[PDB]
Design an enzyme around this catalytic site. Structure first.
Site, PDB file in Angstrom:
ATOM      1  N   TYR A 109     -17.194 -20.672  -3.408  1.00 51.54           N
ATOM      2  CA  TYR A 109     -15.853 -21.164  -3.110  1.00 51.54           C
ATOM      3  C   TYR A 109     -15.811 -22.664  -2.830  1.00 51.54           C
ATOM      4  CZ  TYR A 109     -11.307 -21.727  -0.913  1.00 51.54           C
ATOM      5  OH  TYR A 109     -10.039 -22.153  -0.592  1.00 51.54           O
ATOM      6  N   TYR A 135     -29.930 -16.852  -6.184  1.00 51.76           N
ATOM      7  CA  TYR A 135     -28.993 -15.981  -6.888  1.00 51.76           C
ATOM      8  C   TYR A 135     -27.897 -16.851  -7.484  1.00 51.76           C
ATOM      9  CZ  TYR A 135     -25.690 -12.235  -7.947  1.00 51.76           C
ATOM     10  OH  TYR A 135     -24.820 -11.381  -8.587  1.00 51.76           O
ATOM     11  N   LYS A 164     -32.348 -15.100  -9.603  1.00 53.74           N
ATOM     12  CA  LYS A 164     -31.707 -13.951 -10.196  1.00 53.74           C
ATOM     13  C   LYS A 164     -30.486 -14.482 -10.925  1.00 53.74           C
ATOM     14  CE  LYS A 164     -28.763 -10.072  -8.918  1.00 53.74           C
ATOM     15  NZ  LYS A 164     -28.250  -9.498  -7.706  1.00 53.74           N
ATOM     16  N   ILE A 205     -32.563  -7.006 -10.658  1.00 53.82           N
ATOM     17  CA  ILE A 205     -31.892  -6.534  -9.452  1.00 53.82           C
ATOM     18  C   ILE A 205     -30.615  -5.868  -9.945  1.00 53.82           C
ATOM     19  CG2 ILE A 205     -30.743  -7.160  -7.306  1.00 53.82           C
ATOM     20  CD1 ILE A 205     -32.782  -9.432  -7.027  1.00 53.82           C
TER      21      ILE A 205
END
Ligand SMILES: [Mg+2]
Ligand SMILES: [Mg+2]
Lengths: 296, 296
Positions: A109, A135, A164, A205
């Site tokens: 954000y 991530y 990831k 994942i």
């Protein structure tokens, strides 16, 4: 570098009467263990981290750490924030509760710059002695960890061992492993698990592994053992469920499938998450019929 | 419907030695009041909501509410969250601390569906009796409040009186006011302040008004008086500063500009936000030379 790789599951968080079903949570993790899963990711995005209290965050990590004690399965706890001081605290928090490593989402954000992303993850890495996995999910965060930033963090910070990826950008996963082939690229998109693994990725994942842990772990281990034919076969096989599990925003479809499979008691979310539309409810139920869903 | 419209400022939050500079904060709000601004928006995105503690969240709302006592200037407090229970709590918090209304950004990161967005905002609106302004910024949140959801919330909920659009979608700004012309469309993008106002928008929540409040306030009131020639003239002059204030992610450039103008003492952010590049620092400093920046 200490790493946590292989087939990993982004655990859903079952709720019953507005509270975390602690007995379903432990029961689901031992179902993951028993189907070849190498690590579990508690209270991640699929676990509705955003709507969990920080005490409930503790409860599901402690359940995950205890349920995988005495097994080879590691616990890669979700510990990310768009505020660095909070992300550092969540990283130390996950370490002090037994997690083998942390998954740290890119600040969401507030769209930090690349320089800020580096300092953000540098502070997280220096606060723990456990592995840190970046991530990158730009569709959710509104920002992107560039290849250069990921590589600089991997080389400059000792706990950071990979990233990831949930960006639908196989080009970037070539970019990453061609310029830094020692990092652990992790697939964060079930539909392209095999293409990411076949280019040198060392794990996933997964969202789909909540419902079909045996197939996702078999897929991952086939690819890591370089049996790309059998790995691709499972990937092609699961494309229908891999896509329908995102007919609405994750984890709304996967929780619907878990409920339809009778693995959780309640199709319950915390707002702003809600049950899917009646048409997507039926579509999810229709794609499931093609798969053999392991029980408890 | 009770409304909060006109020229509004998304207040930056000045930091001094890692703490909220509470005396600069009040002085900046009194500079906004003295330059024709109709409302101030504390602890919004431009105020680095994400990296402030709850007490600092309280401190900056109370300072804004106190500084606007005895004035016509209203306080539209930032009180949004990607967790509905947290957003409800932040909404009740802002009301019980004197805010005239709340700005509530759409849930960021967890991508709720439109049905989830409706229940999210319905719960926020039903928890307070002060006006509620929706904030749609899809590039930051990863989701978008559709025109149908914005209109349904406006008609079904009483405190919901409009939306602050930051989506670069003038088509949607026709769609909104053509099907529900009674709502208060607020511009969340300074560069297109006039086009949004000229189609029936009733105010702006501006970043540029931090540096040039008199020019932003004149623009809005010119447009509200249907003096579109004078409004467009100011909007055209402000385009250069409007764009350079976003060369990096907001509020990195505006805080740099406020510092360069001598309005705050320290160019300090909280991570993952950082100072701009040396080249963007120079670009901001160079574009500012063409504008008259009001002092205290
Ligand atoms: Mg009016
Ligand atoms: Mg007039």
């Amino acid at each position: 570098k200490n790493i946590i790789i292989g087939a990993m599951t982004a655990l859903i968080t079952p709720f019953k009467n507005g509270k975390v079903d602690e007995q379903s949570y432990a029961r689901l993790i031992k179902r993951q263990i028993e189907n070849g899963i190498d690590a579990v990711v508690p209270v991640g995005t699929t676990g509705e981290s955003a709507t969990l209290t920080h005490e409930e965050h503790r409860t599901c990590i402690e359940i995950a750490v205890e349920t995988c004690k005495g097994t080879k399965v590691k616990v890669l706890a979700g510990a990310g924030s768009n505020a660095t001081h909070a992300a550092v605290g969540l990283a130390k928090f996950a370490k002090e509760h037994g997690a083998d490593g942390i998954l740290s989402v890119a600040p969401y954000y507030n769209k930090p710059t690349q320089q800020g992303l580096y300092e953000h993850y540098k502070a997280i890495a220096q606060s723990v002695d456990i592995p840190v996995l970046l991530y990158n999910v730009p569709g959710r965060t509104g920002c992107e960890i560039s290849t250069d930033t990921i590589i600089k963090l991997f080389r400059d910070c000792e706990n950071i061992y990979g990233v990831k990826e949930a960006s639908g950008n196989i080009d970037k996963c070539v970019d990453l492993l061609a310029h830094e082939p020692r990092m652990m690229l992790i697939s964060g998109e079930d539909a392209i698990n095999y293409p990411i693994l076949s280019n040198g990725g060392k794990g996933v994942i997964s969202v789909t592994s909540n419902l079909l842990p045996d197939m996702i772990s078999a897929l991952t281990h086939f690819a890591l053992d370089e049996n790309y034919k059998e790995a691709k076969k499972i990937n092609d096989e699961l494309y229908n469920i891999n896509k329908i599990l995102f007919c609405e925003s994750n984890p709304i479809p996967i929780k619907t499938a878990m409920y339809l499979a009778g693995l959780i008691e309640s199709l319950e979310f915390r707002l702003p998450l809600c049950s899917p539309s009646k048409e997507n409810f039926a579509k999810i139920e229709e794609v499931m019929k093609k798969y053999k869903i392991k029980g408890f």
